[PDB]
């Protein structure tokens, strides 16, 4: 399977298929100490995955670009999804998202 369509679970750990989390441009930074281990079995997964773009949203909202290097081709995706402020679950989503972004600096 291609790297962009792999589902992570307790067999394929997030670091085992999406690469070790770090500060580099290609590598990602989400996950704190448990999402990288349980995966989609994380007990608070649906409330985070409700921000996951669908097939028509990723190619309908992102500023897609194509970069060509001697290494090969790369599709560059910048995006911005606004979170509402009226639904009560707002004060459920800011807590989760902050306690997982840029959490690779907190590992020992």
């Amino acid at each position, epitope marked *: 399977k291609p790297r962009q369509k792999r589902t992570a679970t307790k067999a*394929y*750990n997030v670091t085992q298929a999406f690469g070790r989390r770090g500060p580099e441009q*290609t590598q990602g930074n989400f996950g704190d100490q448990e999402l990288i281990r349980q995966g989609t079995d994380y007990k608070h997964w649906p409330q985070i995955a409700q921000f996951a773009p669908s097939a028509s949203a990723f190619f309908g909202m992102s500023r897609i670009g194509m970069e060509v290097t001697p290494s090969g081709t790369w599709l560059t995706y910048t995006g911005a999804i606004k979170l509402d402020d009226k639904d009560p679950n707002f004060k459920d989503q800011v807590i989760l998202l902050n306690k997982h972004i840029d959490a690779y600096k907190t590992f*020992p």
Partner: antibody
Amino acid sequence: EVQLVESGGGLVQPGGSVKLSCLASGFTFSDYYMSWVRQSPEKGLEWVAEIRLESDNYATHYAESVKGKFTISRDDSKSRLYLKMNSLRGEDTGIYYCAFDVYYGGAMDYWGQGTTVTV
Amino acid sequence: DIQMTQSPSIMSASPGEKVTMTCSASSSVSYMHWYQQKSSTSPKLWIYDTSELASGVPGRFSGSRSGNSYSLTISSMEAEDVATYYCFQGSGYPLTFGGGTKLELK
């Protein structure tokens, strides 16, 4: 900080049973995996087995050639990893290492010192 | 289920030259981690996921993903690179190390 220390090895006659130890200090040992890696002067490095967290009922996973004759157990209170052996043949000669990874999975970065087992 | 074989057994080298080590993979290993062990010491990690250099490493080395075949390119040889080098899996549960390549000088 992280500093692994392993001991318990020694001379063992064929068919005997030994019990290596692996003590860790400086990190929450109850929240990481750990595996063993053997070394021989000829066959290089081979994978012994690994162990998983208390969440998955202390799940285990052993290699093929050493599927039997080995058992990894982990008591979390004293923060140690135990690798019990039985009926060691002539193939199990050399140095054994502990190894655990921070980013759970694959790349092992924090190694130990080494424990010498001779037949 | 999975068998891995490094191509060069004992490859010689000369200072400032180019070194190439090849590890095959008859499987679907996502990222091939890559270690190095010196004489009478503990093994250390040198390539994280098929491209990334490790922590505390010269920038000489670089990995590749030429299909199912993986390779390390050492730009220039130096006295600090005479050791054994191993390829390592970690996609499937039955983990398997390679055979090792011994880089000596000329």
